[PDB]
Amino acid sequence: QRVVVAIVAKRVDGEFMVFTHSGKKNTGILLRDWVVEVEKRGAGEILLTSIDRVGTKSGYDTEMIRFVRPLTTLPIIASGGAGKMEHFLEAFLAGADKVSINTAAVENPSLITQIAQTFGSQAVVVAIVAKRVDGEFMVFTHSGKKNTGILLRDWVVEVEKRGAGEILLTSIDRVGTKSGYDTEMIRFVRPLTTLPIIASGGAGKMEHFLEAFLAGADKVSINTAAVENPSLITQIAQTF
Ligand SMILES: O=P([O-])([O-])O
Ligand SMILES: O=P([O-])([O-])O
């Protein structure tokens, strides 16, 4: 329940393939096979990111969601490409249980409110993708590649105000490094919101999950290290 497995996928020669290391590594593993494995290992939720859709605002990859839905009984978080109200409806109709949004929310924060006021707050996860810039935490869109000029402290406050239910807090610089979560970013964010925080990016071992919880994370997300060591999913699942 505190364990989210983030699966990043892309069509490669007609096949849905799994990507790790912040979308830089084609693992050669099929989405089909990895989804089956992650549930078997004990994950509580799946964050399903269609890496081709991120930042594009063209809609969620509902083909990918429909593909995955009969493979698993786990809640699915649709991620990548949300741009308007109708996009969320399509995601739910494809089988998603919650929806995640970054780029279009930054550009139009009232979208968060629109979603929450229809599909509640708990169905809405706002993905915050941040890093240190000139000594301050700043917010980025398009998976971290595009600046906004918005401070993390400001955005966190706004996100809750607009009615999000959960924050997915990704440290751009930690993703795929397996070097630990950005616990200073987490600690920074914790007293700014009452919302459940999902720590994202950098998990490499069991003690990393511990430090994240200690810094204030309510749930933890794992991609790269889980693919390399699926039993890690079980160990953390059996613990929290
Ligand atoms: O597309 P996104 O993931 O929402 O930024
Ligand atoms: O891959 P990740 O996100 O670092 O877990």
For 158, phi and psi rounded to 5 degrees?
Answer: -60, -45
Nearest bound ligand to CA 179?
2
For 215, phi and psi rounded to 5 degrees?
Answer: -80, -10
DSSP 203: -
143-164: burial string, b at 16+ Cβ within 10 Å, e else: bbeeeeeeebeebbebbbebbb
Rounded to whole angstroms, the Cα distance separating 202 from 176 reads 6
Instruction: Looking at the CA of residue 53, tell me the nearest atom of ligand 1.
Output: 1
The torsion region of residue 57 among left (phi > 0), alpha (psi -120 to 50) and beta comes to: left
Report CA-CA distances (Å) from 230 to 35, 134, 168: 11, 37, 22
Nearest bound ligand to CA 23?
2
DSSP states of 112-151: HHHHHTTS-STTEEEEEEEEEETTEEEEEEGGGTEEEEEE
For 232, phi and psi rounded to 5 degrees?
Answer: -65, -35
- Strands (E) in the chain, as ranges, are 3-12, 15-20, 25-30, 45-50, 76-79, 98-101, 124-133, 136-141, 146-151, 166-171, 197-200, 219-222
How far does residue 178's CA lie from ligand 2's centre (Å)?
7
Does residue 224 have its Cβ closer than 6 Å to ligand 2?
A: yes
219-230: burial string, b at 16+ Cβ within 10 Å, e else: bbbbbbbbbeeb
Q: What is the CATH number of domain 1-240?
A: 3.20.20.70
How far does residue 117's CA lie from ligand 2's centre (Å)?
31
Does residue 204 have its Cβ closer than 6 Å to ligand 2?
A: no
Nearest bound ligand to CA 144?
1
Residues 6+ apart with CB under 8 A from 55: 81, 102, 103, 141, 142, 143, 145, 146
Contact present, 202 and 185 (Cβ < 8 Å): no
36-58: burial string, b at 16+ Cβ within 10 Å, e else: ebbbebbbbbbbbbbbebbbebe
In the chain, domain spans = 1-240
